[PDB]
C-alpha cells in the first residue's frame, strides 16, 4: 500500500528513500508505482521542451517550463543546458578545442572532483569508429581523454549481470545476478525482468559502488532511472544535484541509456535505423557537457562513458531446438536464447538424469550451433559455475544463434534482428570505455581490459576503499594521471626446501623401471652444477613463483627445467623451462618409452609410484617438462624422473603430447623463444580457487596421488620479439591456458581426427589470464622482473583472445 496523498512539492528527485506507506518522489518511485499524486506535475515538467531559443533569453521565470532561460536560472541551478550558448554568446563544449586538464579546476566548496558514470546499453565497441561521424561529443571525449579500443564484458554478456559487475567489481557468480532471468532453489523464488521479486535485496550480492560510497561518507546520486523519465530530465536532475549546497551534494552520479540496445534488438547492430539512436545519445552527452560547462564543472568532473556489452546479428531462422535432440523435452525447464541453462521441470521426477541429456546434446549434428557443458567444465575464464542459481547444465551458443526448447516458443511468445549474451570473448559482444577529466590521462589509448576492473578505479577516483572484489587493484593505474593505488606484492607464506642427494636407489619400491644403468670429470662435474642450479637463470626468468599458503615443497633444479615439488600433492605445483627459437624437438627414444626414474632427492614416501598407474585402468601419466625438448640425450633422463610425472587420462594425453611436441616449439619459433610454466590445478568445488588437501575428490586408484581437474601453462616472451625470451630488456608478452583434465574428448567434436585439426582450437577455447591461474593455484608469478609492479598486474590480467581485429 502507498497512501499517495502526500506531495512532491520541494522534494523532486529527493535523495533519501522514504519508508512506505509515505509517497515517494525519487527517480525510481514510478517503477514501484509509489510516486505522490503531483510527481508528474511538479517533477516531470515538459513545457516548452529542452532548449533555449532566442526569444526566451532573459524571460520571466515561469515555474511550469521544463527548464529555464531567465536571468536567475544559473543560481537556481536549472537553466536549459544550451542557455549560455543561445543567450550569452558561449560556444558548445564540443566546439572548444581540447586543452589538457593538468589539475582539477573546481568551484570553491568542492572537496573532490565528482564522478559521473554515463552508461549506454548495447553500445558495441566498433560504434566508436563506425559511428564517429555522427557522434561529435562522444568522439571528443574519446580522443581528448583516455580510451580503450574495447572493454571486455563479463559472461553472460547480458544487461543485468554486466551493470551489476560494473557496480561491484565481481563476477556474476559472486554478486548473484547470473542472468536477466533466474531461479534460486534455496529461496524457491524466481527473478524476472517484469515484476517485483527483482526489487528484493536478497538477489543482489556484493557491495555496489553507491553503498561503498555511502558507508565511507561519500554522498551518491541515486543510480537508477524509471524507464519513462526522459533522458533530458535525467541530465537536468544530475545537473540540479550538482548545484546543491556542499553538505548535500553527491560526489558520484549515474546516467543510464536504454539505447542503443533497444534499437539494436530490432534492427541488428548495424541496421541503417541505428544511426538515429547514436545521434541521440551523442546529443545527450552534449547536453551534459554543455551543462557542466555552464556550471564551470567541465574541467572538474571525471566522466566515464561505458557500455555493458555489444550486440550481434541474430534472427528467428538461426534457432536450434532442443526438441530435435531430446525425447523427454517436457521434463526439462530451459532458460533460452543466446545461452542455455537446463534443469529438471519437477524435483520429484527421479527419472531425470543430466548425463543422458548431455549425451543427447553432444555432437549430434554436422553444423551444430551450441555445445552442452556441465557448468564445471565451462572454460575457467568465464568464471560461471559457483552459484546455486546457475543450472548444472549449460549451453554455449554460437555467435549469431539462438537455442530454444520447441519451435512453438519462438513464434508464440521475425521480430528481433539483434541480441547479445554470448561468450564474452566474442568481438561483437565487446563494448566501450572512455575516461575524461582531471584524474584521467590526456589523449591516451590504453590496451583492452575487463569491466570487472572498473569498480576499483571508480573507488580510486572517489578516494574510497574498494570492498573485496575480482578486480586486480593497480592493474589499471596506467589510465590515471593521479590517485594511483600503489599495491605491494603479497608475502610468500611457505619457503621451499632445497634437497640434495638423500636416498639410495634401492630404498625405492615404486614398481617403476628404466633402461638407464647405461653409463669422467668433464661431464660429472657439470651434472653436479646443473642439479645445484647452474642454469636456473635461463629456465627461471622472472623469479620463482611465491607460494601463498602453508605447505611443504621442494625446489628441484635440472639442466633443462626447474620445479617446485609438493610433498603433499606428490607432484610439482609448477615447472619452469625456457625454449629458445633455436631449440630442437626430438622423439622419446625406444628404450626409454616406459622409463620412470626415482628421484634421489625426494623420499619414497613423498613420491608417486608406477604400480598405481598399472592398476588404474582409467588413468595414465604425462610429464610436465616434455622429454621432447631435452637439450641433450643425457639431459633427457631428467625428464623421466618420478618427480616430473603427473596423472593424465589417455584422452587428455592426446592433447598434452601435441602441445608439448608441436605447439611449444611453434610458439618459440614465432615469439623468438618462450618461457613456459606448467602445472596442475585442483578445483573440485569449481569456485575458481585452489582446493585444499581435504577437498580432493579423486585419486589415482589405490594411492594418495590426487587427480588434477585442470592443467595450466603460462607462456612468456619479449613484447619486442626482436629480442629473445631469455634476454629481454622491456615489456613481456604472455598467453596462458587452463585445460580441463577430462577422460574423454567429447568437447571436441572433431577429436577422431589428427590433433593438428582440433587440439589448438580446444586450447584457444580455454585461454586464461595468469591471474586466473593464480586464484586456482595459490601461487604469485613474475616476482622478479625489471618491470613496475603495476605493469606486471596489467600483464597478469591479460587475456589472449584469438579473435580477429
Ligand atoms: C571474487 O571476489 C569475491 C569477493 O572477494 C570472492 O568471493 C569471496 O570468497 C570468500 C572465500 O570463498 C568468501 O568467504 C566466505 O564467506 C562466508 C560468509 O560470507 C558472508 O558474508 C560476506 C561478506 O559480507 C558476503 O559477501 C557473503 O554473501 C554471499 O552469500 C549470499 C547468498 O547466500 C549472496 O548474497 C552473496 O552474493 C555471496 O554469495 C557468493 O559467495 C558464497 C560464498 O560465501 C557462495 O556460496 C555463493 O555461491 C556466491 O558465489 C556471505 O553472506 C564464510 O562463511 C566462509 O567461511 C567458511 O569457510 C572457512 C574457510 O576459511 C571456514 O574456516 C569457516 O569456518 C566457514 O566454514 C563454515 O561454513 C561452511 C559452509 O557453510 C561449513 O562447511 C564449515 O563446516 C564451517 O561451519 C568464507 O570465508 C566470501 O564470502 C566471498 N564473497 C563474495 C561477495 O562472494 C571470490 O572468491 C572471487 N572469485 C575469484 C575467482 O577469485
Ligand atoms: O536502472 C537501471 C540500472 C541498473 C544498474 C546500473 C548500474 C550502474 Br554502475 C549504472 C547504471 C545502472 C542502471 N537499468 C534499467 C533497466 C536496465 C538497467 C536493466 C535491464 N532491464 C531490461 O529491461 C533489459 C534491458 C536491455 C535488455 N537486452 N536484452 N534484455 C534486456 C532487458 C531492466 C533494467
Ligand atoms: Ca576450489
Ligand atoms: Cl538470461
Ligand atoms: Na593405467
Ligand atoms: Na570428440
Ligand atoms: Zn539487450
PDB file of C-alpha atoms in Angstrom, residues 318-473:
ATOM      1  CA  UNK A 318      19.027 -19.263 -36.716  1.00  0.00           C
ATOM      2  CA  UNK A 319      17.435 -21.110 -33.827  1.00  0.00           C
ATOM      3  CA  UNK A 320      18.261 -24.629 -32.679  1.00  0.00           C
ATOM      4  CA  UNK A 321      15.516 -26.558 -30.904  1.00  0.00           C
ATOM      5  CA  UNK A 322      16.129 -28.973 -28.037  1.00  0.00           C
ATOM      6  CA  UNK A 323      13.150 -30.930 -29.459  1.00  0.00           C
ATOM      7  CA  UNK A 324      15.314 -32.030 -32.425  1.00  0.00           C
ATOM      8  CA  UNK A 325      17.652 -33.666 -29.885  1.00  0.00           C
ATOM      9  CA  UNK A 326      15.709 -34.930 -26.856  1.00  0.00           C
ATOM     10  CA  UNK A 327      12.766 -37.328 -26.408  1.00  0.00           C
ATOM     11  CA  UNK A 328      11.964 -36.173 -22.829  1.00  0.00           C
ATOM     12  CA  UNK A 329      11.632 -32.447 -23.803  1.00  0.00           C
ATOM     13  CA  UNK A 330       8.663 -31.761 -21.474  1.00  0.00           C
ATOM     14  CA  UNK A 331      10.579 -32.988 -18.395  1.00  0.00           C
ATOM     15  CA  UNK A 332      13.034 -30.065 -18.589  1.00  0.00           C
ATOM     16  CA  UNK A 333      12.974 -26.318 -17.951  1.00  0.00           C
ATOM     17  CA  UNK A 334      15.183 -24.294 -20.357  1.00  0.00           C
ATOM     18  CA  UNK A 335      16.369 -20.733 -19.856  1.00  0.00           C
ATOM     19  CA  UNK A 336      16.710 -19.932 -23.612  1.00  0.00           C
ATOM     20  CA  UNK A 337      18.215 -17.586 -26.177  1.00  0.00           C
ATOM     21  CA  UNK A 338      21.873 -16.668 -26.543  1.00  0.00           C
ATOM     22  CA  UNK A 339      22.794 -19.137 -23.762  1.00  0.00           C
ATOM     23  CA  UNK A 340      21.066 -22.193 -22.453  1.00  0.00           C
ATOM     24  CA  UNK A 341      20.557 -23.299 -18.899  1.00  0.00           C
ATOM     25  CA  UNK A 342      18.737 -26.570 -18.250  1.00  0.00           C
ATOM     26  CA  UNK A 343      17.195 -28.039 -15.116  1.00  0.00           C
ATOM     27  CA  UNK A 344      14.527 -30.630 -14.284  1.00  0.00           C
ATOM     28  CA  UNK A 345      10.950 -29.323 -14.525  1.00  0.00           C
ATOM     29  CA  UNK A 346       9.980 -31.313 -11.405  1.00  0.00           C
ATOM     30  CA  UNK A 347      12.327 -32.187  -8.492  1.00  0.00           C
ATOM     31  CA  UNK A 348      10.030 -35.163  -7.809  1.00  0.00           C
ATOM     32  CA  UNK A 349      10.978 -36.727 -11.178  1.00  0.00           C
ATOM     33  CA  UNK A 350      13.520 -39.402 -10.183  1.00  0.00           C
ATOM     34  CA  UNK A 351      13.936 -40.435 -13.861  1.00  0.00           C
ATOM     35  CA  UNK A 352      15.750 -37.166 -14.670  1.00  0.00           C
ATOM     36  CA  UNK A 353      19.417 -37.750 -15.493  1.00  0.00           C
ATOM     37  CA  UNK A 354      21.802 -34.930 -16.544  1.00  0.00           C
ATOM     38  CA  UNK A 355      24.278 -37.353 -18.140  1.00  0.00           C
ATOM     39  CA  UNK A 356      21.761 -38.660 -20.690  1.00  0.00           C
ATOM     40  CA  UNK A 357      20.590 -35.128 -21.576  1.00  0.00           C
ATOM     41  CA  UNK A 358      24.235 -34.052 -22.043  1.00  0.00           C
ATOM     42  CA  UNK A 359      24.955 -37.042 -24.287  1.00  0.00           C
ATOM     43  CA  UNK A 360      21.825 -36.400 -26.429  1.00  0.00           C
ATOM     44  CA  UNK A 361      23.043 -32.794 -26.877  1.00  0.00           C
ATOM     45  CA  UNK A 362      26.660 -33.712 -27.716  1.00  0.00           C
ATOM     46  CA  UNK A 363      27.970 -33.634 -31.303  1.00  0.00           C
ATOM     47  CA  UNK A 364      24.675 -34.792 -32.717  1.00  0.00           C
ATOM     48  CA  UNK A 365      24.561 -32.758 -35.975  1.00  0.00           C
ATOM     49  CA  UNK A 366      27.218 -31.638 -38.540  1.00  0.00           C
ATOM     50  CA  UNK A 367      26.906 -27.844 -38.156  1.00  0.00           C
ATOM     51  CA  UNK A 368      25.570 -27.912 -34.557  1.00  0.00           C
ATOM     52  CA  UNK A 369      25.430 -24.341 -33.199  1.00  0.00           C
ATOM     53  CA  UNK A 370      25.624 -24.907 -29.449  1.00  0.00           C
ATOM     54  CA  UNK A 371      27.786 -27.044 -27.155  1.00  0.00           C
ATOM     55  CA  UNK A 372      26.448 -28.606 -23.937  1.00  0.00           C
ATOM     56  CA  UNK A 373      28.571 -28.430 -20.750  1.00  0.00           C
ATOM     57  CA  UNK A 374      28.272 -29.386 -17.133  1.00  0.00           C
ATOM     58  CA  UNK A 375      28.935 -25.916 -15.654  1.00  0.00           C
ATOM     59  CA  UNK A 376      32.193 -27.062 -14.039  1.00  0.00           C
ATOM     60  CA  UNK A 377      33.673 -27.906 -17.499  1.00  0.00           C
ATOM     61  CA  UNK A 378      32.916 -24.484 -18.850  1.00  0.00           C
ATOM     62  CA  UNK A 379      36.141 -22.605 -19.662  1.00  0.00           C
ATOM     63  CA  UNK A 380      37.523 -21.241 -16.440  1.00  0.00           C
ATOM     64  CA  UNK A 381      37.926 -17.722 -17.956  1.00  0.00           C
ATOM     65  CA  UNK A 382      34.117 -17.435 -17.859  1.00  0.00           C
ATOM     66  CA  UNK A 383      34.048 -17.839 -14.082  1.00  0.00           C
ATOM     67  CA  UNK A 384      30.471 -19.218 -14.415  1.00  0.00           C
ATOM     68  CA  UNK A 385      29.752 -22.092 -12.026  1.00  0.00           C
ATOM     69  CA  UNK A 386      29.994 -21.220  -8.312  1.00  0.00           C
ATOM     70  CA  UNK A 387      26.355 -20.172  -7.776  1.00  0.00           C
ATOM     71  CA  UNK A 388      23.266 -22.248  -6.946  1.00  0.00           C
ATOM     72  CA  UNK A 389      21.341 -20.082  -9.411  1.00  0.00           C
ATOM     73  CA  UNK A 390      23.477 -21.408 -12.287  1.00  0.00           C
ATOM     74  CA  UNK A 391      21.954 -24.612 -13.607  1.00  0.00           C
ATOM     75  CA  UNK A 392      24.325 -27.641 -13.763  1.00  0.00           C
ATOM     76  CA  UNK A 393      23.763 -27.970 -17.497  1.00  0.00           C
ATOM     77  CA  UNK A 394      24.811 -25.034 -19.668  1.00  0.00           C
ATOM     78  CA  UNK A 395      24.775 -24.467 -23.441  1.00  0.00           C
ATOM     79  CA  UNK A 396      27.319 -22.227 -25.068  1.00  0.00           C
ATOM     80  CA  UNK A 397      25.611 -20.947 -28.137  1.00  0.00           C
ATOM     81  CA  UNK A 398      27.487 -19.937 -31.268  1.00  0.00           C
ATOM     82  CA  UNK A 399      27.549 -16.249 -32.060  1.00  0.00           C
ATOM     83  CA  UNK A 400      24.519 -15.328 -34.320  1.00  0.00           C
ATOM     84  CA  UNK A 401      22.397 -18.241 -32.986  1.00  0.00           C
ATOM     85  CA  UNK A 402      19.613 -18.908 -30.543  1.00  0.00           C
ATOM     86  CA  UNK A 403      18.651 -22.062 -28.689  1.00  0.00           C
ATOM     87  CA  UNK A 404      15.020 -22.721 -27.741  1.00  0.00           C
ATOM     88  CA  UNK A 405      13.123 -25.735 -26.304  1.00  0.00           C
ATOM     89  CA  UNK A 406      10.470 -26.299 -29.063  1.00  0.00           C
ATOM     90  CA  UNK A 407       9.543 -24.250 -32.172  1.00  0.00           C
ATOM     91  CA  UNK A 408       6.232 -23.030 -30.654  1.00  0.00           C
ATOM     92  CA  UNK A 409       8.279 -20.990 -28.079  1.00  0.00           C
ATOM     93  CA  UNK A 410       9.824 -18.908 -30.888  1.00  0.00           C
ATOM     94  CA  UNK A 411       6.717 -17.965 -32.948  1.00  0.00           C
ATOM     95  CA  UNK A 412       4.327 -17.960 -29.929  1.00  0.00           C
ATOM     96  CA  UNK A 413       5.980 -15.554 -27.421  1.00  0.00           C
ATOM     97  CA  UNK A 414      10.706 -12.319 -37.355  1.00  0.00           C
ATOM     98  CA  UNK A 415      10.652  -9.508 -34.755  1.00  0.00           C
ATOM     99  CA  UNK A 416      14.234  -9.150 -33.474  1.00  0.00           C
ATOM    100  CA  UNK A 417      17.411  -8.877 -35.572  1.00  0.00           C
ATOM    101  CA  UNK A 418      19.993  -8.317 -32.816  1.00  0.00           C
ATOM    102  CA  UNK A 419      20.800  -9.980 -29.490  1.00  0.00           C
ATOM    103  CA  UNK A 420      23.702 -10.466 -27.011  1.00  0.00           C
ATOM    104  CA  UNK A 421      24.572 -12.894 -24.157  1.00  0.00           C
ATOM    105  CA  UNK A 422      27.294 -14.916 -25.951  1.00  0.00           C
ATOM    106  CA  UNK A 423      30.816 -15.825 -24.793  1.00  0.00           C
ATOM    107  CA  UNK A 424      32.442 -12.591 -23.567  1.00  0.00           C
ATOM    108  CA  UNK A 425      35.455 -13.137 -25.881  1.00  0.00           C
ATOM    109  CA  UNK A 426      33.215 -12.719 -28.978  1.00  0.00           C
ATOM    110  CA  UNK A 427      34.136  -9.475 -30.798  1.00  0.00           C
ATOM    111  CA  UNK A 428      30.548  -8.391 -31.411  1.00  0.00           C
ATOM    112  CA  UNK A 429      29.985  -8.509 -27.586  1.00  0.00           C
ATOM    113  CA  UNK A 430      32.838  -6.095 -26.732  1.00  0.00           C
ATOM    114  CA  UNK A 431      31.832  -2.671 -25.501  1.00  0.00           C
ATOM    115  CA  UNK A 432      33.326   0.761 -24.834  1.00  0.00           C
ATOM    116  CA  UNK A 433      35.318   2.653 -22.232  1.00  0.00           C
ATOM    117  CA  UNK A 434      36.274   6.335 -22.277  1.00  0.00           C
ATOM    118  CA  UNK A 435      37.553   8.224 -19.225  1.00  0.00           C
ATOM    119  CA  UNK A 436      37.666  12.016 -19.348  1.00  0.00           C
ATOM    120  CA  UNK A 437      38.606  14.527 -16.695  1.00  0.00           C
ATOM    121  CA  UNK A 438      41.350  15.750 -14.321  1.00  0.00           C
ATOM    122  CA  UNK A 439      42.134  12.346 -12.844  1.00  0.00           C
ATOM    123  CA  UNK A 440      42.322  10.569 -16.274  1.00  0.00           C
ATOM    124  CA  UNK A 441      45.197  10.836 -18.743  1.00  0.00           C
ATOM    125  CA  UNK A 442      45.158  13.205 -21.730  1.00  0.00           C
ATOM    126  CA  UNK A 443      44.869  11.795 -25.305  1.00  0.00           C
ATOM    127  CA  UNK A 444      45.940   8.342 -24.108  1.00  0.00           C
ATOM    128  CA  UNK A 445      44.986   4.973 -25.577  1.00  0.00           C
ATOM    129  CA  UNK A 446      45.164   2.026 -23.181  1.00  0.00           C
ATOM    130  CA  UNK A 447      45.014  -1.716 -24.033  1.00  0.00           C
ATOM    131  CA  UNK A 448      41.635  -3.537 -23.811  1.00  0.00           C
ATOM    132  CA  UNK A 449      40.646  -4.531 -20.263  1.00  0.00           C
ATOM    133  CA  UNK A 450      37.799  -6.266 -18.487  1.00  0.00           C
ATOM    134  CA  UNK A 451      34.911  -4.435 -16.869  1.00  0.00           C
ATOM    135  CA  UNK A 452      35.439  -6.227 -13.505  1.00  0.00           C
ATOM    136  CA  UNK A 453      38.495  -3.856 -13.133  1.00  0.00           C
ATOM    137  CA  UNK A 454      36.454  -0.634 -13.054  1.00  0.00           C
ATOM    138  CA  UNK A 455      34.962  -0.777  -9.544  1.00  0.00           C
ATOM    139  CA  UNK A 456      38.493  -0.378  -8.051  1.00  0.00           C
ATOM    140  CA  UNK A 457      39.232   2.615 -10.290  1.00  0.00           C
ATOM    141  CA  UNK A 458      35.932   4.296  -9.574  1.00  0.00           C
ATOM    142  CA  UNK A 459      36.722   3.828  -5.849  1.00  0.00           C
ATOM    143  CA  UNK A 460      40.147   5.376  -6.536  1.00  0.00           C
ATOM    144  CA  UNK A 461      38.524   8.370  -8.361  1.00  0.00           C
ATOM    145  CA  UNK A 462      36.396   8.951  -5.247  1.00  0.00           C
ATOM    146  CA  UNK A 463      39.016   8.273  -2.530  1.00  0.00           C
ATOM    147  CA  UNK A 464      37.177   5.086  -1.449  1.00  0.00           C
ATOM    148  CA  UNK A 465      38.499   1.805  -0.160  1.00  0.00           C
ATOM    149  CA  UNK A 466      37.025  -0.832  -2.516  1.00  0.00           C
ATOM    150  CA  UNK A 467      35.149  -3.752  -0.992  1.00  0.00           C
ATOM    151  CA  UNK A 468      36.725  -7.207  -1.704  1.00  0.00           C
ATOM    152  CA  UNK A 469      36.198  -7.784  -5.456  1.00  0.00           C
ATOM    153  CA  UNK A 470      37.636  -9.611  -8.531  1.00  0.00           C
ATOM    154  CA  UNK A 471      39.478  -6.654  -9.956  1.00  0.00           C
ATOM    155  CA  UNK A 472      43.241  -6.591  -9.507  1.00  0.00           C
ATOM    156  CA  UNK A 473      43.845  -3.277  -7.861  1.00  0.00           C
TER     157      UNK A 473
END
